Amino acid sequence: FPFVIFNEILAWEAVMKENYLVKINTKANDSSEEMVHRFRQLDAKLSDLKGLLKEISSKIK
Amino acid sequence: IQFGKYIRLSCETLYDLMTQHWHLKTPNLVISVTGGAKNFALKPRMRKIFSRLIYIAQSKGAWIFTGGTHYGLMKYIGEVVRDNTISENVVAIGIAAWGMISNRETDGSFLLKRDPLYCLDNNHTHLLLVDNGAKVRTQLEKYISERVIPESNYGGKIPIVCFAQGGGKETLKSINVAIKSKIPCVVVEGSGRIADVIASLVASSCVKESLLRFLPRTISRLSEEETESWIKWIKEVLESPHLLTVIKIEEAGDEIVSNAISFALYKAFSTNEHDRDNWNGQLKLLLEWNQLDLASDEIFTNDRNWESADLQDVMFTALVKDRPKFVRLFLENGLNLRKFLTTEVLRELYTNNFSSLVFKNLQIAKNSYNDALLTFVWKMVEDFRRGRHPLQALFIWSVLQNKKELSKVIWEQTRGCTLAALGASKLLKSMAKVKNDINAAGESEELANEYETRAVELFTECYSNDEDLAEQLLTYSCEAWGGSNCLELAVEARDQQFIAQPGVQNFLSKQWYGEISRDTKNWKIIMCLLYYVSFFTSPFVVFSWNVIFYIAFLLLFAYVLLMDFQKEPTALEIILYVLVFVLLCDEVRQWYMNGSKYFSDLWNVMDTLAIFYFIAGIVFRLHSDESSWYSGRVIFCLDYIVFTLRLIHIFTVSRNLGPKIIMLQRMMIDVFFFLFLFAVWMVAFGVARQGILRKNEHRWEWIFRSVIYEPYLAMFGQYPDDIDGTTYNFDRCTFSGNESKPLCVELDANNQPRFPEWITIPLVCIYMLSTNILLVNLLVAMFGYTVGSVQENNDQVWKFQRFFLVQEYFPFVIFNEILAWEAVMKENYLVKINTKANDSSEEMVHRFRQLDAKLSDLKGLLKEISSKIK
Amino acid sequence: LYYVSFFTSPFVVFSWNVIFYIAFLLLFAYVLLMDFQKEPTALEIILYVLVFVLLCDEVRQWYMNGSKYFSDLWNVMDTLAIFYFIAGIVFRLHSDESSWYSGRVIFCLDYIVFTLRLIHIFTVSRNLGPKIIMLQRMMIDVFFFLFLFAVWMVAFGVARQGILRKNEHRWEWIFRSVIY
Amino acid sequence: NAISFALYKAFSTNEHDRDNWNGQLKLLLEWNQLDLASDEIFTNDRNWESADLQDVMFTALVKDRPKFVRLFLENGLNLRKFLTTEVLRELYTNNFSSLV
Amino acid sequence: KNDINAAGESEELANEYETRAVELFTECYSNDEDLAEQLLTYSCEAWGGS
Numbered sequence A: 001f002p003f004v005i006f007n008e009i010l011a012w013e014a015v016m017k018e019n020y021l022v023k024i025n026t027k028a029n030d031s032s033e034e035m036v037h038r039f040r041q042l043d044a045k046l047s048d049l050k051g052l053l054k055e056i057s058s059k060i061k
Numbered sequence B: 001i002q003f004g005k006y007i008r009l010s011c012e013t014l015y016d017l018m019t020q021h022w023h024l025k026t027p028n029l030v031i032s033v034t035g036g037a038k039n040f041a042l043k044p045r046m047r048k049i050f051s052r053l054i055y056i057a058q059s060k061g062a063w064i065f066t067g068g069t070h071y072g073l074m075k076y077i078g079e080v081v082r083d084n085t086i087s088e089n090v091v092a093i094g095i096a097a098w099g100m101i102s103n104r105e106t107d108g109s110f111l112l113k114r115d116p117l118y119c120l121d122n123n124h125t126h127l128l129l130v131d132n133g134a135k136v137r138t139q140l141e142k143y144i145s146e147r148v149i150p151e152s153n154y155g156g157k158i159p160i161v162c163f164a165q166g167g168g169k170e171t172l173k174s175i176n177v178a179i180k181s182k183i184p185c186v187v188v189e190g191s192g193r194i195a196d197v198i199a200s201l202v203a204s205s206c207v208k209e210s211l212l213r214f215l216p217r218t219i220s221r222l223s224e225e226e227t228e229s230w231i232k233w234i235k236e237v238l239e240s241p242h243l244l245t246v247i248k249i250e251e252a253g254d255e256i257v258s259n260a261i262s263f264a265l266y267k268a269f270s271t272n273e274h275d276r277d278n279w280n281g282q283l284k285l286l287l288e289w290n291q292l293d294l295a296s297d298e299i300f301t302n303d304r305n306w307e308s309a310d311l312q313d314v315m316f317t318a319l320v321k322d323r324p325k326f327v328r329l330f331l332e333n334g335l336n337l338r339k340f341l342t343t344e345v346l347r348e349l350y351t352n353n354f355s356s357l358v359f360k361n362l363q364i365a366k367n368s369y370n371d372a373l374l375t376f377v378w379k380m381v382e383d384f385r386r387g388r389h390p391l392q393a394l395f396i397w398s399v400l401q402n403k404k405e406l407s408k409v410i411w412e413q414t415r416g417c418t419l420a421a422l423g424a425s426k427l428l429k430s431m432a433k434v435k436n437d438i439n440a441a442g443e444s445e446e447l448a449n450e451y452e453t454r455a456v457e458l459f460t461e462c463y464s465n466d467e468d469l470a471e472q473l474l475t476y477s478c479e480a481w482g483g484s485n486c487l488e489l490a491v492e493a494r495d496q497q498f499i500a501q502p503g504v505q506n507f508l509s510k511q512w513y514g515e516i517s518r519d520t521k522n523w524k525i526i527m528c529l530l531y532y533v534s535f536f537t538s539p540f541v542v543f544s545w546n547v548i549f550y551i552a553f554l555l556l557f558a559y560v561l562l563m564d565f566q567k568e569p570t571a572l573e574i575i576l577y578v579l580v581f582v583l584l585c586d587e588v589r590q591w592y593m594n595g596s597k598y599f600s601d602l603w604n605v606m607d608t609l610a611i612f613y614f615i616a617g618i619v620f621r622l623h624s625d626e627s628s629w630y631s632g633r634v635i636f637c638l639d640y641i642v643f644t645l646r647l648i649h650i651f652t653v654s655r656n657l658g659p660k661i662i663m664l665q666r667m668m669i670d671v672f673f674f675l676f677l678f679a680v681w682m683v684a685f686g687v688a689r690q691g692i693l694r695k696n697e698h699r700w701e702w703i704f705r706s707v708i709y710e711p712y713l714a715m716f717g718q719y720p721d722d723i724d725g726t727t728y729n730f731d732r733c734t735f736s737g738n739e740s741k742p743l744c745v746e747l748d749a750n751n752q753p754r755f756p757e758w759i760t761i762p763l764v765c766i767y768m769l770s771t772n773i774l775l776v777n778l779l780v781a782m783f784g785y786t787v788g789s790v791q792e793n794n795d796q797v798w799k800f801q802r803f804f805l806v807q808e809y810f811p812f813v814i815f816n817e818i819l820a821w822e823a824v825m826k827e828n829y830l831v832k833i834n835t836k837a838n839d840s841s842e843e844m845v846h847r848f849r850q851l852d853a854k855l856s857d858l859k860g861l862l863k864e865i866s867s868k869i870k
Numbered sequence C: 001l002y003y004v005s006f007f008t009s010p011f012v013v014f015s016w017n018v019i020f021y022i023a024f025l026l027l028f029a030y031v032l033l034m035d036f037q038k039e040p041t042a043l044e045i046i047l048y049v050l051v052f053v054l055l056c057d058e059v060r061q062w063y064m065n066g067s068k069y070f071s072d073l074w075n076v077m078d079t080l081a082i083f084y085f086i087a088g089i090v091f092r093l094h095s096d097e098s099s100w101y102s103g104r105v106i107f108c109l110d111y112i113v114f115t116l117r118l119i120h121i122f123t124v125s126r127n128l129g130p131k132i133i134m135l136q137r138m139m140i141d142v143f144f145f146l147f148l149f150a151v152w153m154v155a156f157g158v159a160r161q162g163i164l165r166k167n168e169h170r171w172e173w174i175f176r177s178v179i180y
Numbered sequence D: 001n002a003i004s005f006a007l008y009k010a011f012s013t014n015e016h017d018r019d020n021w022n023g024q025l026k027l028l029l030e031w032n033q034l035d036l037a038s039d040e041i042f043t044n045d046r047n048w049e050s051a052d053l054q055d056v057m058f059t060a061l062v063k064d065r066p067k068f069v070r071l072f073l074e075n076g077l078n079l080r081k082f083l084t085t086e087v088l089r090e091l092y093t094n095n096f097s098s099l100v
Numbered sequence E: 001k002n003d004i005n006a007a008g009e010s011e012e013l014a015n016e017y018e019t020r021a022v023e024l025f026t027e028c029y030s031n032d033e034d035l036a037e038q039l040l041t042y043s044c045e046a047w048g049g050s
Ligand SMILES: CC(C)CCC[C@@H](C)[C@H]1CC[C@H]2[C@@H]3CC=C4C[C@@H](OC(=O)CCC(=O)O)CC[C@]4(C)[C@H]3CC[C@]12C
Pocket: B522, B551, B554, B555, B558, B647, B651, B654, B656, B657
């Protein structure tokens, strides 16, 4: 006891860190617990429906 | 080149260069049409898609054709290719245009501050430079798609996918000449200029209603004669939508690339008009990719052309390539698993695809932990390796290799699924105990705790129906799949949740009370202590008449030891020699009802040395010498403790003492910490207490009477009774070394006690503070946390060892419809599993999909009425 | 050289520093009780070597760190363990029983400080380990208890002297009856 | 989101500042309108070089525009090239607050 | 500590980047652990001291 006294690893992280930063900046979008964004996507065609009937209203008259 | 290889081409033999001199032939080819994007919005969704794309391309070993320059997506493609190649292989060939390269040289190294030219990308290892004064790239698309590979399930043809995301004329032209060529499988995305136009369109004026919301600032720079030509291209692009696939913004899920690549590769495979008859190739194509919902809807939902007899070669490759949802799809559409699992198919499953890393891990278990079911499977796995309920043999194959989702599929096809959910938990707990890995160990224990909870909810559903039918399942060997029944198989694997459940606990209480009508009262049976003889058949009474025999054994062993035990062994002392032989014979029987798990029990060691010290007591007694006859009585006295402390372990059945005695075996780490602190404090104080006395001999053992023993009595209250001052040399001490009194305080010429007494008095008062208060009262808190923490676990532990005490069952003692009932109830269980994923239904986003299915039908019906008025 | 590579892991280097330390305390025990004559005997000098080893091992902890070594609390106690030991050799080598006995008392009081290092050495053991660090959280519960006990001792002990009455009381018969 | 949208809609339609994407970016940087700066300025690949994106980057750091620092890096900006020895000197002497 | 809300928020962000490094390393360790354990020994081109 007194004798005691007297490349590939970086590339491996770069793939896995990239999948981490991807997983962060989309999980705010993968929250998605409200269909109020999908509610916005519904009424995008209801203006197109009434406008297409307004365009056919000029063709009969 | 230095910043790879390059070549300056001119507008077939290109492919002869890239393969015979350069790298390997490919089973895939993904092409990202861009390159003019010196500026590119690398959004996290566009970053997600092209990072999962190259990971997909590395599983198959593709080439990737990009723009080749150092900006935008091609810089990002090369960065993800380079990191994936270092950590099959992806080659990222760039195809640039040689008039747009900045610093042309003619092993040449490559290197103005606002140049409109392009820097070459560093991480494209092979570059193609087209000379002039897009064409040869699309011709290289058409040649590789016509290149015939015989070892493929695509019909050959080297599956080519084109990824369109950007905009401009240079890609809009490159989608037409893609689609004009056969099999481009162009895939568009919902982010970009042109790729957002073609995504929205899936009339000549209706096209220009789009592409001005998406490309408003390039048509104002365009002539009127060219915007009809731009409309003319998107006319031809939208002509064949079976080569166009969209990755929508709303599908921001997982595997959105492989659900877009394989959908594009299937849409250009089902429309060749000679492979539409070939449903086999479309199934093997849909099996490499994980597209299950396309393989069900497009292949199996017509009843068109199959026999469920050539569904076997696609089944064998669905097992070994880990397709758990496709094993389930082949069994839903008709596949006899007891006929598919021949003796040859299991031989090809146990020799080749059974990984030898698992088989060497079972070679570890042949010496480390020798069990009874492990030696049952070793003959079976080495039966086929040396080349019967075979469906459970496939279940063994899938649970050993930790295939979690596949084993849940094969579990639902067994005939005892109530049984095999425990035997899988036994095999998995063996492998999770042989620890050479950490995440593989931490997941194999997880799946062992899935199949244990799977067997728990099975049995509570079994028990909430007819319980005598449910209790009859626990006794079946079940055509000898395992060694033992469903009840003992949870015991060998220590499935404590399965025995703490109220079905088994009510079963064991019925088996312990025996023929006695259960729940009379516990008092009335003791008041009752060939119908009179059948009372004395229940193991509750056989237990009680082994306690009464044991207490009367101890009362005889008491009376022999105190009033009897003369020089020769008297009359009653011989009856004690008979009663220890009975307890010796009862431990011979426990060496006969078990081989070596009897020795694995701790308390079945203590009762052997209880007999071993007793038979040593008869040896020291029969010597007729008081130098040895008295030491015979001392061994019999010390043996009385070991026999009386067996009355603790006998009363672990009592439902009141029972949990508390097993609770007592959890305090032994709180005690051994307390004894460690107390022994160090005893030696530190007891040796420093000898700054009072001073001599050289001290008997070698007057030290331990004063250094160890006298501070030991201070814990129960002794407090240095008359050595710590104003107690002179009147008695208790010798000055000499005789007699056995502890020797005197060191003195002076004044014959005064030399010890300073301002040091020894606060030394004792510190020690009496610590070990009597700052230590024992600490032990209560560490006891008090233990009963707070392990109490809900001790109930499961006591209910677990409650089985062995019922399993154990006076010298006269020593010397069809049930399967049909489970088949209905198991069928309602497997129905309830595979629809509860659909009965989750907590989001109306599926109903949101059902809403807009008619809004296209509404606007289209108004488009159809628009032609009738005009 | 496979037998020697067993003795390279720090688990064994820890164990052979415990066995050395326990045998240091067993020698320090046997010197303090049966030995320790007027001149320092044969075995007593081997104790002077073993305290120099623990002095050199604290020099090394003053060399693997500069001042975070002193920021540790338990790396202060083992320095005054050596400092009271080297003070013990000073009071011993005087050849005067007025001072030679007080050399043995310092060596006796030093035996507590060296034995209470065996508490801090066994904070690795995964069983005693959490509980010894748990023991350093009770010192605010104890110092509250000692505060309540000392105020109750003085309030009762002084009011216990509506029994006796004198004027001198040695200045220290009070503490034998009011506190002790 | 209503003031800056109104100020942008009357800035992109002057027919002499529609060529000036630099002024429409500095306008959209004072207000925190990120989704308008992405969709209306960066989603055409119309006219920038990612070399005069540096003066708008330096004012996106010192005026605490965290979502616009992210927007300039998504659309191409070499941060190891933008952070010269001079830019860090102008970041450690002036905008590095001396209370810190 | 000369402020209170600035102190109570600077300790919060220190506990964000600590939990950010924890979920990084559990993702590092659930992959190849000898690769993950080799990260803990790198000076990493001498950014910090240790
Ligand atoms: C000199 C020696 C050999 C005589 C032995 C004396 C005791 C060791 C024996 C005789 C009386 C026994 C007890 C008599 C009554 C029972 C109640 C029994 O608890 C229950 O029955 C639970 C239900 C209930 O509350 O009644 C558990 C064992 C116990 C305590 C026995 C424990 C061991 C005892 C104390």
